Design a protein around this ligand. Structure first.
Ligand code: MAN
Ligand code: MAN
Ligand code: CA
Ligand code: CA
Ligand code: CA
Ligand code: CA
Ligand code: CA
Ligand code: CA
Ligand code: CA
Length: 313
């Protein structure tokens, strides 16, 4: 019939309730009337103090290991007055305290997101478990300020929380490849508890940058009697894409139908040099079309105007 209560994580010899008064006895008589505890299970976590006629704690008491998720933490014990032959039921409540903040299961999480991803996409975030329940349980999720994302606290009829990261501004690894965000799980206590997990956004690459030359039109003036193999020009095209998507290949547009090449444009480094003596060819003005190509078959087109200056006259 009796109901007591006691805070958790308390010490040994801590009062639970004035049992001598509710038992119809007197303090000194507690040892005299031969009343003891019938220790069945968790009832062993308590002991009787016959000196002051009280029920006291005799071991470590923590709701997390005893009750945890259950809203009421109750321990029902049976106390027997033998001489009177009377039995009594004692229900004991346990107060939850804040000694267990919301802790994540991972200290970090990497989210691989491609640039091509349009706003509206969503990627799951870690969750922190709260051993304590109530106000001393997980209360909020805070996300460090960014420009491309937003913390969506999803909640269904299930009851629990689902923190998902929503993209609302397109990413671009050609500008910024990685991002570092902070996921703070907070708890309402005194002071407010909290833990944090790291969120690394790894922006994967897509081939969206087409090759683009340094100049629409390349211009060079060289004497006809210049030695073959002379470095006329160093052609270059830009492609900020990652690795294979950034590999640029330079070549003449009409390279396939040509017979004897007058100039050699290197496939990789794009170095344009003299192949044959320009004097014998007797050409005074060249206007050649060149192109640059990546593995995505994206083209860049440019021109090169070679003015050949005659010597002997
Ligand atoms: C998480 O947030 C709390 C405030 O809610 C801090 O007290 C704690 O140190 C951690 O930064
Ligand atoms: C949680 O987040 C904080 C940033 O507020 C980190 O400094 C900490 O190491 C933990 O990952
Ligand atoms: Ca506790
Ligand atoms: Ca607790
Ligand atoms: Ca807590
Ligand atoms: Ca891009
Ligand atoms: Ca790219
Ligand atoms: Ca490219
Ligand atoms: Ca000549």
């Amino acid at each position: 019939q009796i109901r007591y209560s006691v805070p958790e994580e308390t010490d040994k010899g801590t009062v639970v309730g004035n049992i001598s008064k509710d038992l119809g006895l007197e303090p000194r008589e507690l040892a005299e009337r031969g009343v003891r505890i019938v220790s069945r299970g968790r009832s062993q976590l308590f002991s009787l103090n016959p000196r002051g006629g009280s029920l006291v704690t005799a071991g470590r008491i923590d709701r997390e290991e005893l009750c945890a998720q259950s809203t009421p933490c109750l321990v029902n014990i049976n106390i027997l007055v033998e001489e009177k032959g009377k039995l009594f039921g004692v229900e004991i409540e346990i107060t939850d305290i804040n000694d267990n903040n919301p802790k994540f299961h991972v200290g970090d999480l990497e989210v691989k997101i491609n640039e091509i991803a349009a706003p509206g996409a969503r990627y799951p975030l870690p969750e922190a478990v709260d051993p304590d329940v109530g106000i001393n349980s997980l209360q909020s999720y805070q996300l460090s300020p960014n420009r491309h994302f937003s913390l969506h606290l999803q909640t269904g009829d299930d009851g629990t929380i689902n923190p998902e990261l929503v993209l609302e501004r397109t990413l671009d690894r050609e500008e910024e490849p990685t991002h570092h965000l902070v996921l703070t799980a907070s708890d309402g206590g005194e002071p407010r508890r909290s833990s944090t997990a790291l969120i690394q956004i790894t922006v994967l690459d897509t081939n969206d940058n087409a090759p683009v030359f340094d100049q629409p039109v390349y211009r060079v003036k060289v004497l006809e009697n210049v030695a073959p193999g002379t470095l006329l020009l160093t052609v270059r095209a830009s492609d900020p894409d990652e690795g294979v998507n950034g590999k640029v290949t330079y070549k003449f547009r009409k390279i396939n139908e040509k017979q004897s090449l007058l100039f050699h444009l290197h496939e990789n480094t794009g170095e344009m040099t003299v192949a044959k003596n320009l004097d014998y060819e007797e050409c005074s003005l060249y206007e050649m079309e060149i192109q640059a190509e990546d593995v995505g078959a994206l083209l860049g087109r440019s021109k090169v105007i070679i003015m050949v200056e005659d010597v002997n006259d």
